[PDB]
Design a protein around this ligand. Structure first.
Ligand SMILES: *[C@@H]1O[C@H](CO)[C@@H](O[C@@H]2O[C@H](CO)[C@@H](O[C@@H]3O[C@H](CO[C@H]4O[C@H](CO[C@H]5O[C@H](CO)[C@@H](O)[C@H](O)[C@@H]5O)[C@@H](O)[C@H](O[C@H]5O[C@H](CO)[C@@H](O)[C@H](O)[C@@H]5O)[C@@H]4O)[C@@H](O)[C@H](O[C@H]4O[C@H](CO)[C@@H](O)[C@H](O)[C@@H]4O[C@H]4O[C@H](CO)[C@@H](O)[C@H](O)[C@@H]4O[C@H]4O[C@H](CO)[C@@H](O)[C@H](O)[C@@H]4O)[C@@H]3O)[C@H](O)[C@H]2NC(C)=O)[C@H](O)[C@H]1NC(C)=O
Ligand SMILES: *[C@@H]1O[C@H](CO)[C@@H](O[C@@H]2O[C@H](CO)[C@@H](O[C@@H]3O[C@H](CO[C@H]4O[C@H](CO)[C@@H](O)[C@H](O)[C@@H]4O)[C@@H](O)[C@H](O[C@H]4O[C@H](CO)[C@@H](O)[C@H](O)[C@@H]4O)[C@@H]3O)[C@H](O)[C@H]2NC(C)=O)[C@H](O)[C@H]1NC(C)=O
Ligand SMILES: *[C@@H]1O[C@H](CO)[C@@H](O[C@@H]2O[C@H](CO)[C@@H](O[C@@H]3O[C@H](CO[C@H]4O[C@H](CO)[C@@H](O)[C@H](O)[C@@H]4O)[C@@H](O)[C@H](O[C@H]4O[C@H](CO)[C@@H](O)[C@H](O)[C@@H]4O)[C@@H]3O)[C@H](O)[C@H]2NC(C)=O)[C@H](O)[C@H]1NC(C)=O
Ligand SMILES: *[C@@H]1O[C@H](CO)[C@@H](O)[C@H](O)[C@H]1NC(C)=O
Ligand SMILES: *[C@@H]1O[C@H](CO)[C@@H](O)[C@H](O)[C@H]1NC(C)=O
Ligand SMILES: *[C@@H]1O[C@H](CO)[C@@H](O)[C@H](O)[C@H]1NC(C)=O
Ligand SMILES: *[C@@H]1O[C@H](CO)[C@@H](O)[C@H](O)[C@H]1NC(C)=O
Ligand SMILES: *[C@@H]1O[C@H](CO)[C@@H](O)[C@H](O)[C@H]1NC(C)=O
Ligand SMILES: *[C@@H]1O[C@H](CO)[C@@H](O)[C@H](O)[C@H]1NC(C)=O
Ligand SMILES: *[C@@H]1O[C@H](CO)[C@@H](O)[C@H](O)[C@H]1NC(C)=O
Lengths: 438, 133, 132, 132, 439, 440
């Protein structure tokens, strides 16, 4: 004598892929401008008593959206800015040997060129400094900007800030964000401690490679996460439970020149350096780094065997963007040599850095950005919160296993902070039998 | 308790929380101006809002089709089939959550819905003829 | 069989009215990518979807106002006028195509709608007064 | 007149509920230029979407409270003298609905919570009675 | 013993800010406003008088004003967006004076320039000759450049596009209503007694001007002074007049236009030679009408400042041409008229010389300048001065005399003149009240 | 005492205009990515659509005023322009050309129809210049006074179409939005405007190929097995006549010259695709129509045509009236290139293997607009194309005994009117009332 009854408002959800709308708590900050919707002053996390749920960070749709949207914002930021097409001319360059430390001779060049002025008929002589990474030789003194043979270069508007600011992703009505609270969750499988939130915590959109900067720490113990721990074709994301402080700088005291590239437009040129020329570099505490690696190794031993002979080595060859550590400090673009961090086998550190002004903001090509010069001296301090590593393939049963740092899609940085979140949709109609009939 | 606070609760007890989910599902000019200028983003949000309305209305129309609109709890004239479930009434209303129940009988969703539609049409026609006199 | 058969008996139509009601309401990421770039097509499609929703709701609101909501066929208390139609059931119910007859009543449709709203307005007051 | 009842007393105003209810949900050349002006297209479209959402929120509440289908419903929640200590003649003593509303103001949220709980308890009780 | 009853459709509303629809009379073409403010207004306004309803209006905080400002600028930009750029013309000019049929007033005002510019083919160059007004051209180092070369880009308005103001009606979306204050002699803020509800506003012509307000309402029965704060000398005063003052504005010179092919499919429209004698543009104001009108304003000012206070007017103020003079868009060309002859009196026909400029930063923002194509023939405009924008030059210990100046550099305050009587509210249909029933 | 009864649903409708949406089925990946019609009719078709046989329904289908046609037209214009947005401009090529004749291995018929031009053009850098060489068809080059310029330079800027983008008709389906339906007239001999009894309802139309042509309609329907003549008003000489044939006539078009392409860098991310140099001998483009088939087909048209004229009057056909190239010749777009073929050989008879020479043009004005211009990249190799002639656009204009018909062009709307002549869009209106035996 049971009859079908229908209940509307049943607390049941199914996995879903929907658009998230972005919110957050300067005025020229691109992220702050876009995610301008204010957040909940006091978000309410609701613990779900006796709910078990499965999470999979490697297929997390939230990561894919963060990737798509951040790329779009960079394009929107540059969309209204001045093009540098008029500067793609033959350059007449000299060596710049005045007050240069011997170890960096050749990094800077001093080039002159014929630029148009605001009136179309008149021309002007312009002098500007460049890095050797941006300027390429034609066929002794004649050079061109590297992208003259591939793409238009758009300079960034000098007022725009690209400083990472925490961003919170919120569910649209009908959806909810579930999160794991379990410690030591390795990314693929059920978690027992599950809460529901309206928005994620604030995630800073930090763009970097090899070493993840300014993220969260792994509670009380190092967590090694990978899609497949025995597949050398997959990347390993290592989250540290301690931060490592790194001090980076560009010591040269710079000046900015601004010239009349065209009506209503200005081009930003690097002017004479006020003082001596020295290399950009980063400081890593030596003892701290040695302890950090030992901790990572302990966790690798658990996955690969207690024989624990493990070797670290430098990055593979390839393009500058993948082989060196990359970051944006003070608005400047740095590429740093990390071989000094991966020189031990288990059983202060100064990293030299180079500066580049013409930037491919993402792995795609055909568009490029010009980074205007920043005056003064740039120095910043940041936290290393995790690493991206690849286990080398090769002969099996090696007594010594090998790991090397490396890059990959930007998606992988975002997978770290978002590893604990999932989006589901609420489906309110439930049907069950009972004793009630009309 | 909270919005999905009853999610891990026994099915019977959780029925008294239906009001909150039913309502939640249908719930800074400087910012608005910026985002308005950003056309593609604005379109994505309109599409999201339009769909949310569409889904809401779909569910309301369906309760209308079954003839129990306006209620959170519907009683019927369609019997439960042992084919759909052979579980004990004790198990159905206790010692189980709604999440578990939903996956266990997800295979028959469309059967039940079709039966409910037929039942309602038969009832209305009979009422039309009974009033006629 | 979305339209059923216009030429069928008016009462025969009862059998497909559920179908007609359900058909009023409606995954390739790629269509989404194209429409977002195709701004003008994006707007036209949203306008079409919004219109469909507005039309649906206007009819439901109207049934609500008339006191005919929640049912496919509503008996009301408005007298039928010989000036609208002067035919018996064999002539006007069992032997009519819905479409030809729908056209003739259109003249008098707004009159009928106003009358339907007033009848319900009176009924609601009467029920509130009876429930002392 | 849509707000013709604005100056009416609460009692008198009960006869115009229908006109307001209808108003709440109320050229090729225009369509072509509005679509081209992407921003005007979006601003007007957003307004239409919002009007629908607001309409539905009110209808859902009447559903939740057990008042759907009617413009006027009696409930099973007693009036609290705290909300208003006026007697029936005073409430309807030539007070404009709007003035009265200003006097209640913040008590509205309390009332809705009471109505929502009452209706849900009622449905459980009815389900059990039907089963008997 | 009363119980809760819920009512839907109660006549209750609250203040709100929303988007209004732009509608216009359903009847010319190629007019920016008429083309885009496409919704027709054929029904007569459904004005519903509200008996015994008091409501508070505040023109200074009215968001209908802000919305028109935003939409007008936005529409302006959309109109110009698809037109030819004149950036190819920012070249060194070779200029001499026009000495042909010159009187003393225009001596040095009109200048004859020639220059090297492009042709349909990218290989060729041509020499062309055009006339400019002195206000648009700046000397460098006979060598000149256009002034809008270092700070902005110049675009040309399309010659087929008209910017003549036509009536605009703002209409509420469903769920909203517009409340209209009909009290006569109503001051900028406070409660209104004669309140009515409409679906759309009175048509407003989006006339752009500085210092004097033109072609608006007439303040019913008397001169009315409205200000945000009369005491505070930092605020502008909007004064509406109950008599129209006729003003005739003329640009007597007979122009011709030259069509030049700057590039493939592109055209530049240049000012050609003047046919006939050269004369200064000017506007006529009746002497007695102005004198009596101003005296009426003065009486109203004493109403707030005292019967022993002397009121004097001063001739404008220092600053940019756009704010020191009275700007028209007469005939589609831009006039900058000298008002010193209107505001030189002390209380205890008139001809205004005008200059013409073609490169216009119509909005106060910098970076986009529009070039007005010349209009051939002779231009004459006749219009109604319906109000004044005055500044009280206060802030000093001189109770004996107050000084007023014409002024105001913000079009936002022009729309406040017509929108002061309208308010937008949102309808709230759910109300709850007790009665003698229960379930 | 039968009173008002309110019915929620009623099987009724009224004629209405509404925006339709497009669906199509790409059968292959390249099509999905680069075919213009495939990328912008993303939505897949219904795997199994149905047709509902309404019975005892008689309805009017006015094709001349059909909004459905109007939408197809405006939609194709917009789509065409959209496909050209992310493409290289050829503004830098609007320069003086130095041109001589191509005299190497060329038949006299082509003499003067092809020129060898050179010019100074930009390079990757703003300062440096290069000299380049290319060939042009006579139609696109105008002598200025051996100095020439491109014909578009005095009217509009020209954009080069993107080299891998394909503009090739695939079946297109139009589908109704919910609340709307598409009615069809299945009457075998249904004449353009006026009521029919064979009416059915569908969700989507059958596929229509958006084939663009100007005189002869290609790859359409075959007139329900009878030759059918349709027009808005037979009497009015200002109206065009759409004639559908009951069998197809094949037309074999070839562009025999073996072309090559030259890729020229004109800026940092900009390439121009030049016409190269012809390999082998130079011959005239042409189309072959079976003579016997054409004769017989035309005779059938004449027999039907006379139905509305005197039984023994003379039907004279003649070649094109004066007009522009796009009007007087048969514009045939195939293999990626635009042919303008001379059809006078098809209309030179009086009633009571035909080789058509063709010209090639690269600068195109697809929709007869002159505010733009397009440059068609050259196609390498040799083009061979066989099409089905399915119908004609004809113009009739006190000669009691003799009447004259000429082929001619017109608005592209006419091509679509022909294919969509049988469809109508209506709006469904569910509410209605009746007098019945009940009270509340
Ligand atoms: C109305 O509807 C009709 C359909 O009913 C539409 O007609 C169709 O239209 C399409 C589109 O134009 C055509 O598709 C292309 O066809 C070509 C050629 O194939 C046809 O012609 C062959 C002729 O060769 C034989 O006869 C000649 C006589 O002069 C003789 O000289 C020669 O030696 C030889 O004897 C036929 O053989 C061929 O098969 C036919 O014959 C069969 C007989 O038994 C019969 O059974 C068949 O049914 C058929 O009739 C056919 O008729 C194809 O080459 C082309 O394919 C492209 O894509 C493929 C895929 O990758 C590629 O492999 C090809 O090489 C080619 O791509 C290259 O060439 C393109 C230019 O055509 C160029 O743009 C590409 O970039 C690419 O170039 C690259 O590769 C080359 C390689 O050599 C390299 O050197 C370059 O540097 C570069 O890297 C398409 O399939 C249909 O054929 C046509 N149908 C008919 C019956 O004609 C009609 O369009 C509609 N009407 C309108 C107005 O729209
Ligand atoms: C990980 O997290 C750290 C900590 O937030 C980030 O490092 C910070 O980065 C910001 C942005 O570059 C730094 O802020 C800048 O400081 C400059 C120096 O200011 C000194 O002098 C002023 C005097 O008034 C003091 O108030 C101030 O405290 C300092 O002592 C300023 O000159 C900068 O302002 C100028 O540039 C900005 C550009 O956006 C313009 O908007 C301004 O108008 C102005 O022209 C700016 O305030 C901050 O100092 C850094 N802190 C540390 C510890 O490094 C890391 O970058 C982040 N990691 C990664 C990878 O991003
Ligand atoms: C306050 O309000 C007044 C009244 O509306 C405004 O003054 C009017 O302004 C308009 C626009 O400039 C004037 O209309 C123009 O008249 C010109 C003269 O017409 C002659 O030829 C016609 C026959 O064709 C005769 O009937 C007529 O008597 C004249 O002999 C026309 O040439 C103008 O049209 C030209 O420009 C338009 C674009 O706008 C093109 O489309 C046309 O093809 C053509 O090239 C135009 O019709 C009107 O006459 C003025 N009225 C008065 C009394 O002077 C004020 O400007 C306004 N004040 C403010 C501050 O805005
Ligand atoms: C100096 O010029 C030579 C080429 O003549 C080059 O090889 C060398 O690297 C240059 N030195 C610097 C500091 O640029
Ligand atoms: C953690 O790793 C183990 C293998 O050592 C695997 O079986 C388990 O499912 C993983 N759990 C999560 C949450 O990733
Ligand atoms: C309101 O209007 C009436 C009639 O137009 C007028 O007499 C009265 O003075 C106005 N002012 C009021 C009453 O607020
Ligand atoms: C009148 O306007 C003045 C502006 O200074 C304002 O201070 C005053 O309150 C207004 N009075 C009313 C309520 O009309
Ligand atoms: C047949 O076609 C002719 C052509 O103009 C038209 O005049 C006539 O009305 C058509 N007849 C019908 C009803 O199909
Ligand atoms: C058709 O055109 C003729 C003139 O050629 C005209 O007399 C006749 O009335 C027209 N018929 C229609 C369809 O209106
Ligand atoms: C071909 O058509 C002509 C009429 O133009 C006719 O005289 C001739 O006999 C026809 N030939 C055939 C194929 O019978």
């Amino acid at each position: 004598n049971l009859w079908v009854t229908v209940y509307y408002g049943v607390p049941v959800w199914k996995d879903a892929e929907t658009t998230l709308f972005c919110a957050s708590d300067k005025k020229h900050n691109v992220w702050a401008t876009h995610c301008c919707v204010p957040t909940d002053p006091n978000p309410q996390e609701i613990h779900l008593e006796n709910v078990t749920e499965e999470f999979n960070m490697w297929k997390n749709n939230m990561v894919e959206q963060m990737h798509t949207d951040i790329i779009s914002l960079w394009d929107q930021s540059l969309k209204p800015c001045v093009k540098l097409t008029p500067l793609c001319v033959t350059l007449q360059c000299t060596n710049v040997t005045n007050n240069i430390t011997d170890d960096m001779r050749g990094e800077l060049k001093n080039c002159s060129f014929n630029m148009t002025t605001e009136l179309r008929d008149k021309k002007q002589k312009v002098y500007s400094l460049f890095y050797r990474l941006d300027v390429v030789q034609i066929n002794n003194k004649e050079y061109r900007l590297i992208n003259c043979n591939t793409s238009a270069i758009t300079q960034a508007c000098p007022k725009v800030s690209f400083e990472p600011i925490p961003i919170h992703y919120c569910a649209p009505a009908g959806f909810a964000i579930l999160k794991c609270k379990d410690k030591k969750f390795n990314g693929t499988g059920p978690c027992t401690n599950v809460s529901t939130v309206q928005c994620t915590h604030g995630i800073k959109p930090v763009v970097s490679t090899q070493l993840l900067l300014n993220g969260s720490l792994a509670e009380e113990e190092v967590i090694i996460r990978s899609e497949n721990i025995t597949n050398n074709a997959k990347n390993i994301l290592v989250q540290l439970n301690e931060s490592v402080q790194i001090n980076c700088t560009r010591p040269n005291n710079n000046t900015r020149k601004s010239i009349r590239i065209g009506p209503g437009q200005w081009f930003y040129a690097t002017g004479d350096i006020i003082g001596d020329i020295r290399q950009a570099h980063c400081n890593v505490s030596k003892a701290t780094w040695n302890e950090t690696l030992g901790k990572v190794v302990k966790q690798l031993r658990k996955h690969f065997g207690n024989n624990t002979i493990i070797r670290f080595a430098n990055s593979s060859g390839g393009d500058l963007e993948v082989t060196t550590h990359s970051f944006n400090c003070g608005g400047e673009f740095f590429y740093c040599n990390t071989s000094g961090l991966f020189n031990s086998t288990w059983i202060s550190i100064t990293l030299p850095c180079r500066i580049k002004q013409i930037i491919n903001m993402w792995q795609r090509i055909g568009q490029a950005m010009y980074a205007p010069p920043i005056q003064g001296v740039i120095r910043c301090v940041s936290n290393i919160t995790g690493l991206i590593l690849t286990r080398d393939g090769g002969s099996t049963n090696s007594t010594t296993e090998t790991f090397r740092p490396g890059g990959g899609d930007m998606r992988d940085n975002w997978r770290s902070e978002l590893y604990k979140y999932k989006v589901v949709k609420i489906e309110p109609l439930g049907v069950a039998p009972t004793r009630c009939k009309r | 308790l909270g919005f999905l606070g009853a999610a891990g609760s026994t099915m019977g007890a959780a029925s008294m929380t239906l009001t909150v989910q039913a309502r939640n599902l249908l719930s800074a000019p400087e910012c608005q101006q910026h985002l308005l200028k950003l056309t593609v983003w604005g379109i994505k949000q309109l599409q999201a809002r339009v769909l949310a309305v569409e889904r809401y209305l779909r569910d309301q129309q369906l309760l209308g089709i079954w003839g129990c609109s306006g209620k959170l709890i519907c009683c019927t004239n369609v019997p439960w089939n042992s084919t759909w479930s052979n579980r004990n009434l004790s198990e159905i209303w206790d010692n189980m959550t709604w999440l578990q129940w939903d996956k266990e009988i997800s295979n028959y969703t469309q059967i039940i819905y079709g039966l409910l539609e037929e039942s309602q049409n038969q009832q209305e026609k009979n009422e039309q003829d009974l009033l006629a006199l």
